[PDB]
C-alpha cells in the first residue's frame, strides 16, 4: 500500500524540523514543571495539564502541516507526485498518517515524562487510577491534535503561497483556542436577556478544544457522544480537506 510509503517520508521529514523539536522539547519541560508544582508543591494537576496541552498541541499540529500541501506546490514536488502511481486521496491520507504518528509520539515524550514525574514523586499516588486517567489523557490529546492536523490540510489546500498559509494557520489557532471561548464569555456577561444559558452545553460541541476539556472533567451529555463528536470533527474536516485537494 502506497499510503504508508508516503507516511514513512513524513516521519523522517517531520522529526528533523527544528521548529517542531523546539516546541516539543518546550512541551515536555512544561509538562514536568506543572507536575513539579503539583506534587512537590491528581485531578487538580490533570486539569492544569489539560490547559497546557490545549495551548501547544494545536500549535504542534499547525507547525507540522501548514505547509503540507502548499509547501509541496511551492517546492514543485506536488506536481511531480501526481505523475506517480498515486491518487490524490493517498497523498493526503498518507500525510495524515505520517503527520499523525509524529504528535502521537510527541505526547509520549510530552506526557511520558509527566507521568514519570507523578508516579515517582508522590510515593503513594495509587497508580491504578493513573493508568486509566492518563490512558484517557494521551488518547484524547492525540485526537485533539488530529483535528488541527486536519484543519491544517484544509487551509493549506486553499491558499497558493506558503506565506499566506502561516497567516491563516495563526488565524485558525487564535480563533479556535482563545477567541471562541472569549466570545462565549462575552455572550454570557454582557447578554442575559437574549442568551439562554441552558443552550450553552450544546455550543461547547462546536469547538474541538472544548470537547477535549469535557473528556478530562470526568455535564448533561454523556462521555460517548463527546468521543463520537471529536471523531466526527476529524472525519468531516478530512473529508473537507479531500474535497479541496481535488480542486487544485
Amino acid at each position: 500500500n502506497q499510503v504508508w510509503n508516503i507516511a514513512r517520508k513524513e516521519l523522517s521529514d517531520g522529526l528533523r524540523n527544528r521548529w517542531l523539536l523546539a516546541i516539543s522539547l518546550l512541551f515536555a519541560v512544561l509538562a514536568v514543571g506543572i507536575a513539579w508544582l503539583g506534587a512537590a508543591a491528581i485531578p487538580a494537576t490533570i486539569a492544569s495539564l489539560a490547559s497546557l496541552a490545549t495551548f501547544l498541541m494545536p500549535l504542534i499540529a499547525l507547525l507540522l502541516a501548514y505547509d503540507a500541501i502548499v509547501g509541496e506546490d511551492e517546492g514543485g514536488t506536488l506536481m511531480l507526485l501526481l505523475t506517480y502511481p498515486l491518487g490524490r486521496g493517498q497523498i493526503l491520507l498518507g500525510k495524515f498518517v505520517g503527520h499523525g504518528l509524529i504528535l502521537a509520539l510527541a505526547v509520549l515524550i510530552g506526557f511520558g515524562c509527566a507521568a514519570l514525574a507523578i508516579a515517582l514523586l508522590v510515593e503513594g499516588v495509587e497508580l491504578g487510577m493513573l493508568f486509566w486517567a492518563f490512558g484517557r489523557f494521551m488518547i484524547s490529546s492525540t485526537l485533539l491534535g488530529w483535528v488541527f492536523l486536519a484543519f491544517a490540510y484544509v487551509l493549506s489546500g486553499k491558499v497558493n503561497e506558503k506565506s499566506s498559509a502561516a497567516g491563516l494557520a495563526l488565524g485558525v489557532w487564535f480563533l479556535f483556542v482563545l477567541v471562541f471561548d472569549l466570545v462565549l464569555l462575552a455572550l454570557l456577561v454582557l447578554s442575559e436577556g437574549k442568551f439562554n444559558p441552558e443552550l450553552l452545553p450544546w455550543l461547547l460541541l462546536l469547538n474541538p478544544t472544548d470537547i477535549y476539556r469535557l473528556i478530562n472533567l470526568s455535564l448533561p451529555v454523556p462521555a460517548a457522544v463527546l468521543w463520537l463528536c471529536l471523531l466526527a470533527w476529524i472525519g468531516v474536516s478530512l473529508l473537507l480537506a479531500y474535497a479541496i485537494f481535488r480542486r487544485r
Binding site: L178, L185, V189, D210, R213
Partner: protein
Amino acid sequence: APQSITTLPLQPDGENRWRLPAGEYQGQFTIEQPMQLRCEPGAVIQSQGQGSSLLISAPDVLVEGCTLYEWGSDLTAMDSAVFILPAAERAQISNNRMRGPGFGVFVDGTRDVQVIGNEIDGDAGVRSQDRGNGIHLFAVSGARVLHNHVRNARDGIYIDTSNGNHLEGNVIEDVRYGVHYMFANENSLIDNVTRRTRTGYALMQSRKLTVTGNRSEQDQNYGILMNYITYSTITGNFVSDVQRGDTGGDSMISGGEGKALFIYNSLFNTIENNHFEKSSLGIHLTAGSEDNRISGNAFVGNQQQVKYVASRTQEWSVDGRGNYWSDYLGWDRNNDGLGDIAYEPNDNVDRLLWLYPQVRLLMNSPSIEVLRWVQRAFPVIKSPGVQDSHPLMKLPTEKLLT
C-alpha cells in the same frame, strides 16, 4: 412530680448540705429550698420519660454529682433535665451526667447560674429536629457555663438575649449547631471546641461580644457564621476543614459548599490572629458587611480564600500589618515580617464564576488562563477588590495547631 426531700438524703454537714447515696431513683424532682445536695457516683436518678426531671425554684442550690437518665421530650412544655426558675438565682450544676431526649439544662431569667463540667449526651435516633437543646440559656445576666461536654443534642448551646456570661472550655460534638447566639449583647466565649457540626458558631444579631481561642474541627458548611454582630472581637479562633454538606432543616441558613467564616451584615468588629484552614471557602464577605479591621489571620490551604462579590475596594491591613496567605507568591527584600508586594486574592474571572455558574464549564480553557494573566499585566481591567498591602510572610498562629 415528687420533690427532692422525698428521697433519702444523708446529710454530711449541717449547712443545708445533703448527700444522696448510691442507688437508683424515679420520677421528676423539685427543689423548693436552698439545699446544696451532693451525690455519690452511683446515684442514677432515672426518670420515666416525662416531665422536667430536676426542677429548681430556690436560690443558691449546688447540685453536684448526679447522674440523670430519661426525662421527657415535650419541647413545648420544656421537659428539661434541670429546669431553673428566675427566682433560683446563683445555682451551681457541677459534674453531672445526663441522657434524655429533651433539654439538658434549661435556664431562664436567672443570674449567676453556674453550669460546670457536665456531660450531656442528648439522643441517638431523633433526626436533630426534636432532640432539645444541650445548654439552653434564656436571658441570663452573670452566668458561668464552663468545661461541659454536650453531645448529640439539637443546636448545642442555645443562648437567647443573655447579656453577660462566659462559655469557657466546653466540648461540643456531633450536634446541629455548636453555639447559637440570639441578641446576646456584651457576651464572651473562650476556648470552646466544636466537632462535626452542621454550623460551628451561630452568631445572630448579638453585639459587642468576645469570641476567642475557639476551635472548629471538621464542621459542615459554616465554620463561624456571624449575622449582624457589631463591635465584636474575633481573636485566635481556629476553624479547620469546613466540608460541604447540609444542615437538614435549612431554617435560618442554607446549605453550603463549606465556608470557614461567613460575615453577614457585621459592620464593626476586629478579626485578628485567626486560622482558617483547609476549607472550600476561607472567608465569605457579603456586600453589606464592609470596613472592619481584619488583620493578622492565616488563610492557609483553602481552595478559595476570599469570596467578595462586590466592586468596592477593601483594604485588609490595619497599621500596615496584614494577613498570612498560603498562595502568596511574594518576596521580602527589606527584612521585616511583611511581604513587599500587595496580594489580590480575587481576579475579575474569579468573580464571573460566582456571578454565573455556567462559566465552570469554561474554567479550564486557555483563554481563561489568558484572562488570568491579562489582569496581571494590565491593571486597568482589574476590578477594585479585597487586596491587602503588606501581607505576612510566616504563620502568625504557630500555637493554634496543637
